Amino acid sequence: GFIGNSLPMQAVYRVIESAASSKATVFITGESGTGKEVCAEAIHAASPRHDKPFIALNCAAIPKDLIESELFGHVKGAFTGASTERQGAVEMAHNGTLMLDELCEMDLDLQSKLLRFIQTGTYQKVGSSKMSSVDVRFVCATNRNPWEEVQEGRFREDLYYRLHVIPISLPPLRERGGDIIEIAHALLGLMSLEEGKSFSRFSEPVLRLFESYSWPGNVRELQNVIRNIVVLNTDDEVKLEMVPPPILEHHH
């Protein structure tokens, strides 16, 4: 779902294609705002299991005490809030690909249960001792340095080495050559549809700025900038005075 054919992305695409035909676990890293879920979905789409579900569990978007419920499910009444019985992400992903995003947010207890599941395919819903099993291909991602999480004792060493089979390090936006403006154009069209506008081009100073700024927030930051411009202005062309702070100030 990536856009562009910059040199560093070509290397990513080659690994995606080769990894897609394997069940080996992929472990994605990259700076804040790089496309970890885009990469995970692209692996699924290129894989023989592309017609089965792709499911992404963002471990940070969930209270830490509820990751286990979201991952493995829960029976009714398993904990005070368990209003009904819930199907886990592992069941939704059976025969497909499960992305464990922001994996280092799991507590050490859940990491132990996860490692068991990865080894065997067997799990239990929260609140039950009954075993079930599924078949998932795992893709993991983190914005931490996973080796550092291990050295600091926040992430299990056995789990790290079980999962870290096919690492993919995503190129930061600033290193992606022509991809920056290709992505920016796609976002310009999409945000224009969202907002009822009709932006179609960037002026040459805007092109130069977007192609020189360091984009510390990567593609998320570019999405914010394009959304800002389309929400706050009405024109066919993005002009330099429309670019929000502190892009220009920081750039200098």
- Apex 32 CA angle, 237 and 108, nearest 5: 155
User: What is the Cα Rg of the chain in Å?
Assistant: 21
Q: Is residue 213 within 8 Å of residue 222, measured between CB atoms?
A: no
H or E element: which one contains 154?
Answer: none
Q: Is 96 annotated as contributing to ligand binding?
A: no
Task: Give, as one character, the DSSP assignment of residue 126.
Answer: B
Residue 81 marked as a ligand binder: no
Q: CA triplet 102, 36, 133: central angle to 5 degrees?
A: 60
153 annotated as belonging to a binding site for a ligand: no
Q: Is 34 annotated as a binding residue?
A: yes
124 annotated as belonging to a binding site for a ligand:
no
Tell me whether residue 181 is annotated as binding.
Answer: no
Q: Is 219 annotated among the ligand-binding residues?
A: no
Residue 108, Cα to own-chain centre: how many angstroms?
A: 22
25 is in an annotated binding site: no
Tokens of 15: 């690994």
| Dist. CA 237–CA 57, nearest whole Å | 38
44 dihedral zone (left: phi>0; alpha: psi -120 to 50; beta): alpha
Say how far apart CA 192 and CA 145 lie, in whole Å.
36
Q: Is 180 helix (H, G, I), strand (E, B) or coil?
A: helix
Could you list the residues known to form a binding site for ATP, using ranges. Answer: 3, 33-38, 220, 223
- Binding site residues, as ranges? 3, 33-38, 220, 223
